[PDB]
Amino acid sequence: MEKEFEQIDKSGSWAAIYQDIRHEASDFPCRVAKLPKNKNRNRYRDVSPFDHSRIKLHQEDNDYINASLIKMEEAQRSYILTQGPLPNTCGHFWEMVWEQKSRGVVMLNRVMEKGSLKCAQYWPQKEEKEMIFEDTNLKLTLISEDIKSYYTVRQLELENLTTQETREILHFHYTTWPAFGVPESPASFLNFLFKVRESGSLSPEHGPVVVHCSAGIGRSGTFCLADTCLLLMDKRKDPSSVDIKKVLLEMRKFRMGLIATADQLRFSYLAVIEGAKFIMGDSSVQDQWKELSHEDL
């Protein structure tokens, strides 16, 4: 697979390849998203979920949320990609988490990035100051927090105020990934992904992991593409049989715009190449990634 990468890098064709993907990508209708009663539920007016793969709230009032189920049949994993919640969609976001039985949330943006507000503060930052979402009958409490240098893992308790059932949700927050940019290194990315993997949040007995950033297509797309490719490599039991480009086009049947720059696509290759070492049998490269990540202090 490194052959294909070494060539593109010498030829400098990354932007041409990325443009090729945009041209070939699926184009399905988004009628529910464009209804006028849903205008205030969309963060960006050029980013919408397809009708056929959108998540529906179990709600009679309005079942709409800007979120898409990305079901990778062959890799046998599902992801929910969504926009960073808005002040009025925090209750819907956690309604979705609950109804879809998600166990993990991956957040790849910061609440404020280069000036502009990218996301609402949708989870509690202090144990003693829990959030109640009255519109959706949910209560959310911070339980503990594991702060590392470039990411933080929080343990949250989601309580359904109707039934008093409670569930534990793991929140993985990547703090050093700029909008329209890439991670510092494949090591810090893969260390983050394997932390998510190790938690069990991606296990198929749970509902789909929820992944978001600002729009839920760029950094969110990079994260899900790398994970699925490494899944395919392991399942087929053949590294260089995985075509990153075809996998990304498959994902874009479920949500528009996944992977937002040509450099994010280059990084995706770089990350799958580096991750192949673990899949091939070098299980100890994982501890290497942890060291190159500088996750302590």
Place this chain on the structure above:
Amino acid sequence: EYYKV
């Protein structure tokens, strides 16, 4: 408010 800004 457009993603392609």
